[PDB]
């Protein structure tokens, strides 16, 4: 999770200030691939919701709870990657939606399993890995953009 966050943020830095030489051109495509294959991996590839019920006593449910938080963070760093590269591409905003759809499916699943026991699981209320930078620039464009060239992709 954090490693993807690190690579993403270093990557954005590298594009922005350094460029104005094979490793980064590779890494762009690494992430693009990781996105495209993560898009169509529906938790039976990661053994979740049916093969696991994330029971925090069992070694399997605890391992599910570890890998689940990894992928939630992973999805988020890719939300960042997707948005960052492209100047408002409606394909890549659908990519962002799909990463969130995976994260949000893990969200409402872990809400179902947190609805039975007491609300002591503050591991689900662990911080996002996003630079505040991001939360600003996302919210900027979500609430304060009337630019019609962006507007179809932000809808």
């Amino acid at each position: 999770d954090y490693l993807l966050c690190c690579i993403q943020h270093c990557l954005a830095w590298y594009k922005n200030t350094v460029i104005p030489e094979a490793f980064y051109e590779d890494l762009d495509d690494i992430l693009e691939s990781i996105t495209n294959r993560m898009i169509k991996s529906e938790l039976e590839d990661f053994e979740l919701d049916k093969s696991a019920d994330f029971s925090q006593s069992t070694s399997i449910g605890i391992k599910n709870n570890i890998s689940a938080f990894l992928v939630m963070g992973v999805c988020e760093v890719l939300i960042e990657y997707n948005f960052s590269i492209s100047s408002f591409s409606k394909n890549r905003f659908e990519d962002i939606l799909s990463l969130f759809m995976c994260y949000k499916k893990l969200s409402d699943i872990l809400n179902e399993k947190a609805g039975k026991a007491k609300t002591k699981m503050a591991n689900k209320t662990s911080d996002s890995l996003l630079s505040m930078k991001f939360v600003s620039s996302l919210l900027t464009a979500l609430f304060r953009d009337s630019i019609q060239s962006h507007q179809e992709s932000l809808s």
Binding site: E44, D45, E47, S51
Partner: protein, 53 residues
């Protein structure tokens, strides 16, 4: 067969199948029902091992 469905490769599967078939000449059916018991229910953890089979 374990190696073959861990990697989900048909080459070693085909080898094992033809091996048991020539070993028969109903030992094929014996080995098949042995597979059906706690091998063929989960060849791989993913149920695409069934699709390759």
């Amino acid at each position: 067969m374990a190696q073959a469905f861990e990697s989900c490769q048909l080459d070693s599967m085909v080898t094992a199948f033809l091996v048991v078939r020539q070993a028969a000449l109903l030992s094929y059916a014996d080995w098949f029902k042995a597979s059906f018991g706690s091998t063929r229910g989960y060849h791989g953890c993913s149920k695409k091992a069934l699709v390759f089979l």
